[model samples]
Target: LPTAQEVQGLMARYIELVDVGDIEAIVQMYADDATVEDPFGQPPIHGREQIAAFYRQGLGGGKVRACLTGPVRASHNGCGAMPFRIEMVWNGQPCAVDAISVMRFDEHGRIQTMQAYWSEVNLSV
Candidate 1:
């Protein structure tokens, strides 16, 4: 397992992928069996294909972008939290959301699980 700072660096790369609108590259960061559950309550998306689909639908037209709000918080056991802010156009208006995403890494440092915590309550247009 990587050290906490190493995992944080890996997470920084993931955030950079979002900032660059590279959805395909983002999904490639996941392990084959990785899963994602955004907003805390949605059904978990399994596999790279499904994860890619989720991002594609959510980031339609490359309009949505994200960046980490602070340094990633990680444990030596390969689990971490990356707090972020997403800016996008929704309903023809610009909106921003503050969210915290936690991830667990696999043996090879690929993302094994990811879950984002945020809701409409965090949105500001």
Candidate 2:
């Protein structure tokens, strides 16, 4: 488990990394056996290789951007939730999605689980 401050920092770091568009670097933040579920109801992706594939173009291409919309909410239980927005072009139309991700960290400070909450209902063009 991690302290709230640590989780908060890690939360921000993830968003920063996402904006950087570096999948490998972002995957490095997760535990080797981590699972990720963006738009959570879908099947989760497991392990680093799968995780890398999952994020390979997550909000990809130039002009796509991810940024926080509110403060990161963190718990002392190694979990944190963050509200953010992803702006990208879909079919040459500008669109954005309001999303939130809850991640749990391992004792070694690596993210063990990531669950992102969003849906087509949250997207606007």
Candidate 3:
């Protein structure tokens, strides 16, 4: 199994694929039943095909991008959380979203689920 930091890097690689609009590589990272929800409170994407298409159409248009940085809030028992901010150029306007992402890793060091919680509360600036 990968160490906590290695798993975290895998998470970062997934986000990096998003930033570069590399949908194909992103699809390979997921397990057969894996679920990826870009933001919390929204519908989750599961299975292989639905999850692949969701990201391809939604995030591959070069409109949204994500960047994650972490102090790695907690790294015990194959679970971790980290603070992240995603800057998106939505509708021709730059937007910044702040949230904490809770990550769960499988025993084999693959990511099982990633859930992000964010709000539009601070767009005033």
Query: Whose lDDT is higher: candidate 1's or candidate 3's?
Result: 1
List model 3 lDDT by residue over 1-125, tens digit each: 45677766776776788777787787777666878776788988887788789877767667666677666554756767777666666667677777777777777776677787776673422
Candidate 1 least-lDDT 10 residues? 55-64
Q: Name the Cα RMSD for model 1.
A: 1.0
Taking every candidate in turn, the Cα RMSD to the unseen true structure, in Å, is: 1.0, 1.1, 2.5
What would the TM-scores of all predictions be? Answer: 0.95, 0.95, 0.77
Off by over 4 Å in 2: none
Error of 3 at 44 (Å): 2.7
- What are the per-model numbers of colliding residue pairs? 0, 0, 0
Local distance difference test values of all predictions, in order? 0.90, 0.90, 0.72
lDDT of 2 by residue, 1-125 (tens): 67999999999999998887877789999999999998899999899998887787664466778999999999978999999998888889989999999999999999999999999999999
Best by lDDT: 2
Error of 3 at 34 (Å): 1.0
